[PDB]
Amino acid sequence: SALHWRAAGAATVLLVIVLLAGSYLAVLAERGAPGAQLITYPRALWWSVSTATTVGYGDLYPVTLWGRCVAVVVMVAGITSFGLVTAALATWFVGREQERRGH
Amino acid sequence: SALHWRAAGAATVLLVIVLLAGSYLAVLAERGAPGAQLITYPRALWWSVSTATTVGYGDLYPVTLWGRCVAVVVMVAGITSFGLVTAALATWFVGREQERRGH
Amino acid sequence: SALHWRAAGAATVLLVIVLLAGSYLAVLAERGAPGAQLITYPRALWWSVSTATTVGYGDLYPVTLWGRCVAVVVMVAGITSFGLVTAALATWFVGREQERRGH
Amino acid sequence: SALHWRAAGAATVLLVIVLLAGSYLAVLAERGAPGAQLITYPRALWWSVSTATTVGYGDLYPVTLWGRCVAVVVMVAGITSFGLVTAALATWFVGREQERRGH
Ligand SMILES: CCCCCCCCCCCCCC(=O)O[C@@H](CO)COC(=O)CCCCCCCC
Ligand SMILES: CCCCCCCCCCCCCC(=O)O[C@@H](CO)COC(=O)CCCCCCCC
Ligand SMILES: CCCCCCCCCCCCCC(=O)O[C@@H](CO)COC(=O)CCCCCCCC
Ligand SMILES: CCCCCCCCCCCCCC(=O)O[C@@H](CO)COC(=O)CCCCCCCC
Ligand SMILES: [K+]
Ligand SMILES: [K+]
Ligand SMILES: [K+]
Ligand SMILES: [K+]
Ligand SMILES: [K+]
Ligand SMILES: [K+]
Structure with a gap:
């Protein structure tokens, strides 16, 4: 299992962990602020994912x-x-092209 | 036809399929929710594309x-x-630079 | 002048052309639609650039x-x-690392 | 210390400098415009970072x-x-795969 695939897998798991941790911490940080809307966990998770993808x-x-x-x-x-x-x-494509070139 | 170009082509077709499928499913999921606005297909497709590009x-x-x-x-x-x-x-550029270097 | 740098330069000029063309065409397409706001050129250019960067x-x-x-x-x-x-x-970095490796 | 890591480090420091400089200049440019909201430094920094990440x-x-x-x-x-x-x-992964291939 090449490094880049393992890294990709690990990155995915870590991101999920961050999205989860971010939704909890966001609610924790926002309650207590008059007018705040990021205060219930389900929508906070929606907020986390739409922020991580940078959709906003x-x-x-x-x-x-x-x-x-x-x-x-x-x-x-x-x-x-x-x-x-x-x-x-990119690493995957680069590798396949090298092979296609006989290397 | 190198892999990366075929992959790029296939990715494009798949994305179009997802944008299409996403607009239908979004309307399907949203109607029935008081206040929802993602409920007619044309604007749902606009929503899908502006989300996929992450413009939001x-x-x-x-x-x-x-x-x-x-x-x-x-x-x-x-x-x-x-x-x-x-x-x-990146693969295309990497390949051309190698050639430019006599490889 | 390596391909990737020329491509990068050309991409930049083309993007500027698209941002310009997009602001004109956006105003052209939007005037006539009751409620539309993308109807004067200066803000249309602001809209174009903030869309191209996907900031939205x-x-x-x-x-x-x-x-x-x-x-x-x-x-x-x-x-x-x-x-x-x-x-x-990426091509630039890949090239420098190869050299750093004596290639 | 390979170039790409140094570049990555330098890019990070420069971005922070731009976010800082951008918040000051944004407030400087916006005060004086009736209705403007980007006029106090703390939220201007929040605006800068959420723009740089393209979250918007x-x-x-x-x-x-x-x-x-x-x-x-x-x-x-x-x-x-x-x-x-x-x-x-990408450079890091490309390098590791080459090694994994005995190069
Ligand atoms: C540490 C922080 C952890 C936060 C964990 C969040 C737990 C919430 C329980 C999960 C679902 C509840 C569903 C519900 O009844 O809510 C729906 C109401 O319409 C939709 O809500 C929502 O917006 C949920 C959307 C979540 C999208 C997640 C995408 C992940 C890639
Ligand atoms: C499975 C889900 C499939 C969804 C398919 C959507 C089919 C809609 C018919 C198509 C056009 C209707 C035009 C119209 O009269 O609408 C215009 C009203 O101003 C603009 O609307 C719109 O916002 C349409 C914009 C679509 C942009 C698509 C970009 C794709 C890269
Ligand atoms: C084919 C379509 C072409 C569109 C061309 C647009 C021409 C507009 C004339 C240019 C400036 C006018 C200034 C003004 O008085 O406007 C200011 C009012 O506050 C700010 O406006 C604005 O929002 C202009 C911001 C433009 C940012 C461009 C960034 C490019 C990377
Ligand atoms: C040249 C331009 C320089 C601009 C420098 C800005 C200096 C501001 C002082 C710093 C913090 C003040 C805290 C406060 O009491 O404000 C809080 C009020 O709720 C939250 O505010 C905020 O929104 C601050 C969030 C900043 C996020 C920065 C992320 C960087 C990666
Ligand atoms: K974005
Ligand atoms: K965005
Ligand atoms: K927005
Ligand atoms: K908004
Ligand atoms: K946005
Ligand atoms: K709004």
Whole structure:
């Protein structure tokens, strides 16, 4: 099992862990802030995933410092995780082309 | 026809299929939810494509569990599909540079 | 001048052309649609760039079929253009590591 | 220390500098525009980071020419910086696969 595939797998599991951890921590950070909407777990998970994919509909978002810090972590984990999948695909293609070239 | 170009082509066709399937399933999942707006097919397709590209204007979004699950599938298919195109471009450039180096 | 750098340069010029063309065509497609906001050129250019980078604040967006089609073109051009820059960076790094390995 | 890792490190520091500089300049550009909301530094930094990651919730955005120009710089720096991290990961994977192939 090549490194890039293992890394891709691990990245996926870690992202899921971050999305989960982020939804809990977001609710923890946001309750107590008048007007906050990221305060129940199910929609917080929806918020986490739509932030990690960087879609950001804006239907939900953090208003506190720690909620936003949590958000940045979720964003970075999502961007780098998917970026890593891209990197693994590149490695796969590069390898196949070398073979196709007799190497 | 190198693998990366075939993969890029296939990824494109699959994405189109997902955007189509996602618009139908989104409407199916969202009707029945008071207040939902992702309920007619044309705008649902607009929603699907703007989600797959991860643009997310927020003019439309799912409010139900299954609509959101459908959304996650659309997001992932879009991100990985475009990511794959990037990976194919990298393979193309890597190959040309090797040649430019006499290999 | 290696291919990837030339491609990166060309991609940048083309993107600028698309952003420009997209702002004109968006206004052309949207005027005539009651309620449309993407109807003056300066903000249309702001809309084009924030769509191409896939940021999508949602302060502006197309409501017509052709405005949305124009949007999809802008999105794709932005994603693939930046993706190509990424691919060129990968080629640059791959080349330097080979050298660092005595190849 | 291979180039790609140094580049990745430098890209990260530069991005942080841009996010910081962007929040100051955004407030500078936006105050004086009736209705503008990107006018206090803490939320401006939140705006900068959520723009650089291209998340774009839409809770905050620039309304002036220079605020939007600043925004474009932030967007580009974010996209290219994360793109570079992706490129570095690809180089790392490519290198490990070559070794795994006895090269
Ligand atoms: C540490 C933080 C952990 C957070 C864990 C969240 C646990 C929530 C229970 C799970 C589902 C509840 C369903 C429900 O009745 O809610 C629906 C109401 O319409 C839709 O809600 C939602 O928006 C849920 C969508 C979740 C999408 C997840 C995509 C993951 C790739
Ligand atoms: C399985 C799910 C399938 C969903 C299929 C959708 C079929 C809809 C018929 C198609 C067009 C109708 C036009 C119309 O009169 O609508 C216009 C009204 O202003 C604009 O609407 C729209 O927003 C359509 C924009 C579609 C963009 C698609 C981009 C694809 C890359
Ligand atoms: C084919 C379509 C072509 C469209 C061309 C657009 C021409 C507009 C003239 C240019 C500037 C006008 C300034 C003004 O007085 O407007 C300011 C008002 O606050 C800010 O406006 C704006 O939002 C302009 C922001 C533009 C950002 C462009 C970023 C490019 C990478
Ligand atoms: C040149 C421009 C420089 C701009 C520098 C900004 C300096 C602000 C001081 C820092 C924190 C203040 C906290 C506070 O009391 O504010 C909180 C109020 O709820 C949350 O605010 C916020 O939204 C801050 C979130 C910042 C996230 C940064 C993520 C970086 C990767
Ligand atoms: K995005
Ligand atoms: K976005
Ligand atoms: K958005
Ligand atoms: K938005
Ligand atoms: K919005
Ligand atoms: K809104």
